[PDB]
Design a binder for this molecule. Structure first.
Ligand SMILES: Cc1cccc(Cl)c1CN1CCc2cc(-c3cnc(C)c([C@H](OC(C)(C)C)C(=O)O)c3N3CCC(C)(C)CC3)ccc2C1
Ligand SMILES: Cc1cccc(Cl)c1CN1CCc2cc(-c3cnc(C)c([C@H](OC(C)(C)C)C(=O)O)c3N3CCC(C)(C)CC3)ccc2C1
Lengths: 140, 140
């Protein structure tokens, strides 16, 4: 459980928001990209795996599953690539927060990182950031 | 100790590598940018604070300390901004790893994220990624 992540892709303002969700905690990382490609997904995953112990990634669709560039990044980073309700509720919630901060941010990416911050800090009493750290520390 | 980070800036291939070091563990996050500006530093810090519990940032120079954009990001993210050997050895080590992977990466940013990964996973027996998680979990 501690090493399992789910990728998730959603659209906003003509751009794409790529999200990784740590399944057991609900903790997220996200980035704005112009469109989802294999190279963007591969790079996102390389970043994620250098920061957290990513063992398994449930890819968000069959194109990223099939992408040899994504496969190369999973190979490089030691990630097991696998296939994929709660995430749909996650996308609506992320878009909700983005709308609440949109007035504070000129750039979409700034608003998206504000929403990542608010999501990971929200208490509902532990936060997702506390849960992911607690879950991984007990694995150690 | 668990919430203290040090910013660090170094040059390579005509670009800038901006590094945040979790002081107590040696864990790092890094990004390639064209040049260090207040807006790039502010954005980097917003990202960092949504992912880890950043309480205090020792800024890397007086321009980022003074930057009202950096101050605004620290205010937004609840970071105490403060002022600033080991980091110089960190920069040399990061450049060392980047050179070892440079042949595997077309883009500098890819090589930089490979070096972030290798740095955080290296055992020297715990890794920096294990230490930062252990340090923060005990604070909880
Ligand atoms: C709030 C504060 C605290 C302490 C001192 C001072 Cl004196 C201030 C007032 N500041 C004085 C500079 C300043 C710059 C900004 C600012 C300017 N341009 C842009 C592009 C952004 C931002 O993109 C970035 C993230 C910089 C790429 C965006 O996408 O909107 C900015 N940030 C808004 C979001 C933020 C995370 C809060 C950081 C600041 C906003 C507000 C303020 C107001
Ligand atoms: C290694 C492997 C495992 C499983 C299946 C397959 Cl069949 C393969 C072979 N792959 C078959 C596709 C492919 C694409 C690449 C690839 C292509 N273009 C670029 C720009 C990059 C990379 O930028 C990115 C990170 C994609 C923006 C860069 O900066 O160099 C690439 N990555 C090199 C680094 C990586 C983290 C390893 C991920 C792949 C490299 C190697 C391979 C070799």
């Amino acid at each position: 459980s501690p090493g399992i992540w789910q990728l998730d892709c959603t659209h906003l303002e003509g751009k794409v928001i790529l999200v990784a969700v740590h399944v057991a905690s609900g903790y997220i990382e996200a980035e704005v990209i112009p469109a989802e490609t294999g190279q963007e997904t591969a790079y996102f995953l390389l970043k994620l795996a250098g920061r957290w112990p990513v063992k398994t990634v449930h890819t968000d669709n069959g194109s990223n599953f099939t992408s040899t560039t994504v496969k190369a990044a999973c190979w490089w980073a030691g990630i097991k690539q696998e296939d994929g309700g709660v995430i749909e509720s996650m996308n609506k919630e992320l878009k909700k927060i983005i709308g609440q901060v949109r007035d504070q941010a000129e750039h979409l990416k700034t608003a998206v990182q504000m929403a990542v911050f608010i999501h990971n800090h929200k208490r509902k009493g532990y936060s997702a950031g506390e849960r992911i750290v607690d879950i991984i520390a007990t694995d150690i």
